[PDB]
Amino acid sequence: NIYQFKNMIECTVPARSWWDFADYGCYCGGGGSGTPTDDLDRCCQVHDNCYNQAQEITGCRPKWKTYTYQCTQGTLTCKGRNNACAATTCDCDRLAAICFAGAPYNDTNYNIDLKARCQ
């Protein structure tokens, strides 16, 4: 669920408040269309698409599905006790958190005008 995803981000990117990723570019946070503004935005686009794929699983709701994962000593892991839905969304979240940690963060792309620049 979103609470867990937030914690994954805090796990992989300790040097930044997770809020910095809540409204970035065309894909991070609200909005899910247009051309990704940079590498970080591409991470969010992939995450968006991943959730769309997971929701094709019967009764699978990415934003609310509670999965089993662990974050210790710099390692993020999705546990083996997850059913197909939980396993899928945990992986979507894990890959995005890892993607975030290796992508540059440009302050100029934070809180941009989605209606005007993401068409």
Side-chain angles (χ1 to χ4, degrees), residues 25-35 41 44-45 48-49 52 114 118-119:
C26 291
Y27 289 90
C28 303
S33 58
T35 300
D41 204 20
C44 297
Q45 176 189 50
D48 264 24
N49 292 352
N52 280 333
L114 305 178
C118 303
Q119 292 180 55

Side-chain angles (χ1 to χ4, degrees), residues 8-51:
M8 281 194 186
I9 299 171
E10 298 184 309
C11 180
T12 64
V13 186
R16 277 188 175 287
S17 175
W18 66 279
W19 290 79
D20 292 359
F21 299 102
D23 188 2
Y24 186 101
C26 291
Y27 289 90
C28 303
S33 58
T35 300
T37 60
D38 61 17
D39 288 343
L40 178 55
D41 204 20
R42 288 182 174 291
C43 288
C44 297
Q45 176 189 50
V46 171
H47 184 258
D48 264 24
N49 292 352
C50 197
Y51 267 21

Side-chain angles (χ1 to χ4, degrees), residues 23-26 37 108-115 117-118:
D23 188 2
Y24 186 101
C26 291
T37 60
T108 297
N109 292 320
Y110 181 70
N111 182 213
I112 65 175
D113 192 345
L114 305 178
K115 182 181 177 178
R117 294 206 271 161
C118 303

Side-chain angles (χ1 to χ4, degrees), residues 4-5 8-9 12 47 50-51 67-70 75-79 86-101:
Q4 301 176 300
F5 181 40
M8 281 194 186
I9 299 171
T12 64
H47 184 258
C50 197
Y51 267 21
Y67 46 68
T68 296
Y69 75 110
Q70 188 179 314
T75 297
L76 234 187
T77 304
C78 288
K79 301 194 186 175
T88 294
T89 145
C90 185
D91 218 55
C92 292
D93 287 356
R94 181 175 68 75
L95 293 181
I98 293 175
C99 194
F100 287 2

Side-chain angles (χ1 to χ4, degrees), residues 60-72:
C60 195
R61 303 171 282 274
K63 275 62 166 55
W64 284 283
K65 181 64 181 176
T66 295
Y67 46 68
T68 296
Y69 75 110
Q70 188 179 314
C71 156
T72 39

